[PDB]
């Protein structure tokens, strides 16, 4: 008896047009051992906030933690003032309200803390939620859409625990170098759950919610996954894949076929990232079991999903360069600690607090690096040349187009709307546009979403 896949509640506005989110500490159970955990409207993780394009919503956010936090809407095109970056402090026992005017296409976004220097810890403790953005275009497609039955979120996260059962988080020279990772995999907060799905198409909204671990989804019997959406929404047409790499903070929506009497697992395949192939991640690892139900599912896999505009002209666009770097001392000490603890398998398939940088500077909250233009395409050039680590590079306030992903044209399923781009020892270029302002007091962030990198300086602020 695997536990069933937890299904985050779908939260819409009340008669006052408000949604209430309470941030607080509780407890969860992992492998029958109790752990202090944090959640939104609960003990762990959070609800799925459902939003409609063209409507405004007010969110009331109550911080019932004993420490400061912020609430960021990853993937949402909102002004700086409500972005919930590190300047969006919510005092312990306090409340902050933000009004979000939703004006982007349907997509699966998410929300998590952005506390300065502590984002990794606060996510590791359990805070993350989802955002389901709806529009009238997607609803015409007749996709699987029964929340919790044939349309389900799949939030995949690793943790490690101490002997006493508690989550064992640490920001130290090793994790500042290579990230915080664990030996336990969670699926919507549960260990290897099962999900019962009707016969036909099953829609999975995949989120990599790990601090530092990249994933690569596949099925145990190699039935294909049909990618229908990325971070920023629908692809123009479904893209069939047999494996689906997903970086930290990235989302993809896939359809998978379900057939009577043939259960299969969603799995994650070993990755070529430092430290991420330590047993049992050295082999395919189950994520969840899909249990077919002999009832007909109504969803369709349409031939055409949406219209994706051509890439604009690059001639004349403002270019911005973002050179990522890591202090050589950090690389050396951090990698030495890693190799010493785990040995060769840590490279299988191959003051630190301000040692990670962009354009030679560790994140300065007091000093945005530049001011971007509102409403114009820019070409941002982000480089990991000179560094061996993986950096999923994320830009707030936008959904962009990838021109080049780590020195190559992007894969078809990655050629649409994205808020993250891989940077690993090569150069990425993206075409970005900001439709909302962000002042110095509530600046947008651009950073690596390997959270321990972010927390030790690999972030910049920018205004619009
Ligand atoms: Cu973000
Ligand atoms: Cu807007
Ligand atoms: Cu490095
Ligand atoms: Cu990084």
Curated annotation (Swiss-Prot):
Ferroxidase and phenoloxidase activities are enhanced considerably in the presence of excess copper ions. A labile regulatory copper ion near the T1 copper site is important for the copper associated activation of enzyme activity. Ag(+) acts as a potent inhibitor of oxidase activity by binding at Cu(+) binding sites, blocking Cu(+) substrate binding and oxidation. pPD oxidase activity is strongly inhibited by sodium azide, an inhibitor of the electron transfer. Keywords: Copper, Metal-binding, Oxidoreductase, Periplasm, Repeat, Signal. Exported by the Tat system. The position of the signal peptide cleavage has been experimentally proven. Changing residue 387 to A: Decrease in oxidase activity with 2,6-DMP as substrate. Cu cation 4 binds at residues 391, 448, 453. One of its GO terms (biological process) is detoxification of copper ion. One of its GO terms (molecular function) is copper ion binding. Disruption phenotype: Disruption mutant is slightly more copper sensitive on complex medium than wild-type strain under aerobic conditions. Deletion of the gene does not affect copper sensitivity under anaerobic growth conditions. Deletion of the gene leads to elevated biosynthesis of enterobactin under conditions of iron scarcity when copper is present. Triggering CueO activity at need by the addition of copper salts with minor toxic effects on E.coli cells could be used as a simple tool for biosynthetic purposes. The protein was also identified as robust host protein for use in biosensing and drug-screening applications. It comes from the Bacteria. Binds 4 Cu cations per monomer. Contains a mononuclear type 1 (T1) or 'blue' copper site, and a trinuclear copper center consisting of one type 2 (T2) or 'normal' copper site, and two type 3 (T3) or 'binuclear' copper sites. InterPro entries: Cu-oxidase-like_N (IPR011707), Cu-oxidase_2nd (IPR001117), Cu-oxidase_C (IPR011706), Cu-oxidase_fam (IPR045087), Cu_oxidase_Cu_BS (IPR002355), Cupredoxin (IPR008972), TAT_signal (IPR006311). Optimum pH is 6.5 with 2,6-DMP as substrate. The pH dependence of the reaction as monitored by oxygen consumption shows a broad activity peak between pH 5 and 6 and a second activity peak at pH 8. Its cofactor is Cu cation. Induction: By CueR, in response to increasing copper concentrations. Cu cation 1 binds at residues 72, 394. Residues 26-136, 198-263, 351-464 form the Plastocyanin-like domain. Optimum temperature is 55 degrees Celsius with 2,6-DMP as substrate. CDD domains: CuRO_1_CueO_FtsP, CuRO_2_CueO_FtsP, CuRO_3_CueO_FtsP. The keyword Metal-binding applies. Cu cation 3 binds at residues 114, 396, 447. Cu cation 2 binds at residues 74, 112, 449. This is Multicopper oxidase CueO. The lineage of its organism: Bacteria, Pseudomonadati, Pseudomonadota, Gammaproteobacteria, Enterobacterales. The gene is cueO.
């Amino acid at each position: 008896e695997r536990p069933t896949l937890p299904i985050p509640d779908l939260l819409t506005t009340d008669a006052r047009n408000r949604i209430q989110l309470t941030i607080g500490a509780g407890q969860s159970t992992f492998g029958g051992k109790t752990a202090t955990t944090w959640g939104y409207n609960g003990n762990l993780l959070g609800p799925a906030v459902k939003l409609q394009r063209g409507k405004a919503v007010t969110v009331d956010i109550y911080n019932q933690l004993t420490e400061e936090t912020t609430l960021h809407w990853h993937g949402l095109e909102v002004p700086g003032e409500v972005d919930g970056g590190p300047q969006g402090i919510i005092p312990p026992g306090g409340k902050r309200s933000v009004t979000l005017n939703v004006d982007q296409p349907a997509a699966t976004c998410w929300f998590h803390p952005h506390q300065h220097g502590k984002t990794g810890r606060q996510v590791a403790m359990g805070l993350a939620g989802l955002v389901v953005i709806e529009d009238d275009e997607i609803l015409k497609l007749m996709l699987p859409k029964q929340w919790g039955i044939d349309d389900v979120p799949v939030i995949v996260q690793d943790k490690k625990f101490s002997a006493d059962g508690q989550i064992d988080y640490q920001l130290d020279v090793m994790t500042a170098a290579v990230g915080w990772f664990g030996d336990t995999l969670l699926t919507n907060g549960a260990i290897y759950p099962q999900h019962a799905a009707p016969r036909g198409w099953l829609r999975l909204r995949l989120l990599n919610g790990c601090n530092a671990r990249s994933l690569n989804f596949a099925t145990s019997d190699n039935r294909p996954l049909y990618v229908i959406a990325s971070d920023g929404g629908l692809l123009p047409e479904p893209v069939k894949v047999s494996e689906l790499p997903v970086l930290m903070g990235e989302r993809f929506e896939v359809l998978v076929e379900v057939n009577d009497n043939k259960p299969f697992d969603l799995v994650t395949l070993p990755v070529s990232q430092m430290g991420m192939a330590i047993a049992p991640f050295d082999k395919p690892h189950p994520v969840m079991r899909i249990q077919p139900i002999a009832i007909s599912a109504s969803g369709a896999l349409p031939d055409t999903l949406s219209s994706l505009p051509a890439l604009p002209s690059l001639e004349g666009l403002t270019v911005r360069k973002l050179q990522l770097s890591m202090d050589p001392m950090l690389d050396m000490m951090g990698m030495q600690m890693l190799m010493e603890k785990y040995g060769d398998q840590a490279m299988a398939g191959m003051d630190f607090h301000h040692a990670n940088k962009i354009n030679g500077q560790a994140f300065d909250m007091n000093k945005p690096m530049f001011a971007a233009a509102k409403g114009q395409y820019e070409r941002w050039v982000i480089s990991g040349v000179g560094d061996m680590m993986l950096h999923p590079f994320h830009i707030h306030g936008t959904q962009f187009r990838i021109l080049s992903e780590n020195g190559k044209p992007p894969a078809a399923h990655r050629a649409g709307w994205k808020d993250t781009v891989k940077v690993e020892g090569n150069v990425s270029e993206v075409l970005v546009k900001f439709n909302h302002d962000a002042p110095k007091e509530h600046a947008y962030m651009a950073h690596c979403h390997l959270l321990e990198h972010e927390d030790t300086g690999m972030m910049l602020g920018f205004t619009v």
